[PDB]
Write a protein that binds this ligand. Sequence first.
Ligand SMILES: O=C(O)[C@@H](O)C(O)[C@H](O)C(=O)O
Ligand SMILES: O=C(O)[C@@H](O)C(O)[C@H](O)C(=O)O
Ligand SMILES: O=C(O)[C@@H](O)C(O)[C@H](O)C(=O)O
Ligand SMILES: [Cl-]
Ligand code: NA
Ligand code: NA
Ligand SMILES: [Zn+2]
Ligand SMILES: [Zn+2]
Ligand SMILES: [Zn+2]
Lengths: 413, 413, 413
Amino acid sequence: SINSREVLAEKVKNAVNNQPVTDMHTHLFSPNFGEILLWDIDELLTYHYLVAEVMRWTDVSIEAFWAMSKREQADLIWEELFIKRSPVSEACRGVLTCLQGLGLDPATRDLQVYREYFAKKTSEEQVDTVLQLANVSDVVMTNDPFDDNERISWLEGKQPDSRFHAALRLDPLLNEYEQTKHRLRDWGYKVNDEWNEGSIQEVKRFLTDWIERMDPVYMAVSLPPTFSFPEESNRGRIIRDCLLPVAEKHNIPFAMMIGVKKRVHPALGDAGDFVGKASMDGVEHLLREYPNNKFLVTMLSRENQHELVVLARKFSNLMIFGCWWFMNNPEIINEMTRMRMEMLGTSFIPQHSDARVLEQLIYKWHHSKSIIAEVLIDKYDDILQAGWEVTEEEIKRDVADLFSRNFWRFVGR
Amino acid sequence: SINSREVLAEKVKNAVNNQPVTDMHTHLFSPNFGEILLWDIDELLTYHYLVAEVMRWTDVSIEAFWAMSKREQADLIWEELFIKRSPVSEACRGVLTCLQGLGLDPATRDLQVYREYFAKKTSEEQVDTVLQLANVSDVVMTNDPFDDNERISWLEGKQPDSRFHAALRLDPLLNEYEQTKHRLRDWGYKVNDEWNEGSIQEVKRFLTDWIERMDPVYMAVSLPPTFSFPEESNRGRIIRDCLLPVAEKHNIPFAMMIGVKKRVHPALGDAGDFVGKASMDGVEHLLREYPNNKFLVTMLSRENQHELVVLARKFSNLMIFGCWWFMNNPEIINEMTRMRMEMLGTSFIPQHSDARVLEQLIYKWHHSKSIIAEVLIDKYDDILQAGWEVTEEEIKRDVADLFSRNFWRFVGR
Amino acid sequence: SINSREVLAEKVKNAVNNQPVTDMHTHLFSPNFGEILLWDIDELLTYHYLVAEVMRWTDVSIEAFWAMSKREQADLIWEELFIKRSPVSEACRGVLTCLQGLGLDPATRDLQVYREYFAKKTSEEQVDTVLQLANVSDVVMTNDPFDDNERISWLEGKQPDSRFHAALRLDPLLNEYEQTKHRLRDWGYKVNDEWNEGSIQEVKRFLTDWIERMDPVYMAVSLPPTFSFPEESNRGRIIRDCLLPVAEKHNIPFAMMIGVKKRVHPALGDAGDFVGKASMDGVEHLLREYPNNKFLVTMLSRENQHELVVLARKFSNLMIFGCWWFMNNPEIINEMTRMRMEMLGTSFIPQHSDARVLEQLIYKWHHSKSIIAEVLIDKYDDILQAGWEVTEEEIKRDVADLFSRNFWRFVGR
Ligand SMILES: O=C(O)[C@@H](O)C(O)[C@H](O)C(=O)O
Ligand SMILES: O=C(O)[C@@H](O)C(O)[C@H](O)C(=O)O
Ligand SMILES: O=C(O)[C@@H](O)C(O)[C@H](O)C(=O)O
Ligand SMILES: [Cl-]
Ligand code: NA
Ligand code: NA
Ligand SMILES: [Zn+2]
Ligand SMILES: [Zn+2]
Ligand SMILES: [Zn+2]
């Protein structure tokens, strides 16, 4: 029987370690989609989180950086972030965890040898390896139909294998309608100059067509700190007249990732986005006024985390998830997970990887599971000491909810 | 209900600490007996355990040491074992535990201040204080009629107060009969040169007379590693024809402390005794052949401990007790108590203090109770793990047995 | 590759728990042999280990005890060792582990209900249940052709099923030749009043006849602490001229369980045996002088354990096994298993149950595996900290050797 923090630590850690993970938000693709699925050590080293970091050290111009080959960029980052200074940051630590996880050894610092490992495998093979090592059963992708390369793959028949699920990303539609409406037109969607019946209907058609073609687990959009709702604006009207009605009809959750201020440093590309605290008014309104709609929410500002937890206490149609981007660091993951469990028990999704490069599934879940297990141990122990019987089966059940079931239960799959 | 090892631990520790102790073997005396009762920091520091230890470091010759005054010997020991080297030995640690328990501060290393504490009170006052701090309700003395000093107190009609009990110590009679018989004659005991009926009867009379004057809880003797029985020697015959039959008639247990090899280093005085493993044959014979006699046994050799425990499994007229002298060290107390509990459950007496100096009751019991508590927590945890539901009252009961009731139940008092 | 002590511990414990056990020494019999196979709660409670323990507490005379029915004895032991005092001894804890393993609940202390469970089952079923619960694949019995109740079955053709193996126990022959000599004649073995070629041939024929009837994995005998060899005694001659020769020929090992001092307390029956430290001279002689003979050895004295391990280091034809009887207590099992692994790696057999009652296989292996796993985790962790990388397969392999392969490999089966 589990009758001490010591036995508890053992059971919890084992349960967490053995629980297959459903990664509900990533930038990975089923291997049959091709090269869009990034992987290998050079890709890990050139992850944009690492581009931002190397630029704080190297004297090579950002322009010169983008001009180098992938291998050259990787060589530079390795030398600047791993050799010239100890790789202590979270993103650098992650690269090492991945290598060790693959059987490669960071002690040697033999980059050439690590590279040899990857050249000997196919995409299909590396996916099987990585999903096994990271114990991830399901991967949710981010499928942006506005990206020419992605759209053609879907239009030409590409479908993910059983382990990869789609999520319809709509940033261009919702945040750049003035420009995007012209593309909807090129694609046969007759949106008009004014927002009238015809425009509303065609935007719905667009959403419906893609829901049918992608069979997404949810519709998603990343939003700025200034997001508000209701709002007389293109975003405001599209959400109100098109997105919500359609999402309700197909019982598809609407995922909002709030807090990103795009391109504050355009030259850094993907590494050029910033963060800002958002008002909770828009979210509060959506939850209260659309009781039949489901919402998956994660926010970027550290200062929004606690009030977001309280908001989840108010609305059952709100399911909060992950420690997103700038929140995805040990110090923050820890405080967020503890505040969440303290006020929500197990009714939340603690994490997602946001993996852009296959191997990252290894370090993201490993780093995150160690922290989540420690939180669980403290919480199980507090009730154990209070006289509660905690069984191994109940721990497995709760751990299953957090890493996989709560999500599928929420999305209705 | 005790739902966790953590709660079990605190309940066990509380029970053990709160249980009044019957110390069944000491070298302390009821206060009304006089200066025979030793106490205070100078007495603590000149304990022969510390004398043997200081001679391993000091340049002072043993002759000179014995020549010094109490105070001077104590200053030498304090300086050599506490200041020049850290006082990490069990005996030195004990001195510090006593000091702290009395409210003094070891951190200052102010020996003069410590001495001032003791000069401020009377023997009766210190006895009340110490017995309170060490939570000792009953003390069993070692009463030797062959020691001129002690004998006079008894002949004077002095009686120990209710907190002190007598035990008739017989080493001289049993181990040095050839010399001792001449003293018995001087006392009116007409023992002959030949071991005839008259000699036997006079020796029994000597025993009966002191049993009447002291009303001892048991008769005792310390024996050498070569102890044997039956044996055609004064010791073997005195035990066979006098000691055992008298012990039976009075239903008084016979305590045998086996394993000491006396005076291997004469100049060290009380600090000059050694140890040796003994044969279990004599004890086995006594137990089997004298079923109506009760025996209290403790052995000096580490190598005799396990077989002594097995012998206890064989004979109910055998009660084993304590971790004697060279066995009275944490490492040994722990292995001994665990072997004993695993093969005897709670049917034994784990410890006695053997205190020669009053204050020692504090550390002797503090150090032992913590070890005994840890052993109990493990054993209790193991059966909680097996589904047994131990109650707090059952824990207090077992603790009372181990620290007090088992002894009184065995001596029939 | 295990990178953490947590993953190591999980894997080791899993390996240990799942590893089918080969119990190379018990006092159980294949169920087709009849009532000779003891089982059920009353048999557990009346195990002689508990008879010895209850006698240290109960007012009931040993005479009265033997006169009571099995149920009454069981009731008495339960009240005296489990109710009046916490059942903390190893043997008492063992009874509780057995009950819990069978799904019964120790918390209710309902002996009436526990008994009902066994009443509604057959020997065959319980054997299936227990061997399954205790994960024991093979059981080596102790087969004594001198016991009338057992011999009848062997003579009437009864053969144990494939899960039970035989061991030819020869105590009467080797230790009581003078009284056994006459039983051989009565069976057709013409041994003469003197040790001549005729006697040697008849004894050898006796061994050979039974080795033929039993096909035992080895021949065994328990010896006293005084055992020596060579020796001009019936035992010393039978071993030198008969046992060893027949052993080498059929290539079957000779198991010597040394250290038991028989019936030091006759009235206790099976609970009346004591222990003593033996000389190693005899075992050393046999190993050196009989290179072509296999010897399985276990010793009763705590004081023989370390030197026995060192002796195993000297001779490969020596296989030490288990923590026998009075050694079968956690404190000793732990020190023995650690000394053994430290000086012999995995080249030894850690444990055997010595079960006299069927269900004991549950607690004996549960209590023992628990300890062995801890030792393994510590030893594996030490090399891991040294840089060694152990695989789960190497662990399952090592665990296989300890609990089964080492034995079968030594016996040559
Ligand atoms: O790597 C990231 O986390 C960002 O660059 C984005 O992918 C962000 O997670 C998003 O989904 O908008
Ligand atoms: O202080 C001691 O333990 C010894 O010097 C003796 O008193 C011994 O305990 C004994 O009782 O003979
Ligand atoms: O139960 C026991 O362990 C003993 O009584 C004997 O069976 C001993 O193990 C032996 O086999 O000689
Ligand atoms: Cl020894
Ligand atoms: Na904090
Ligand atoms: Na030890
Ligand atoms: Zn993302
Ligand atoms: Zn003493
Ligand atoms: Zn046996």
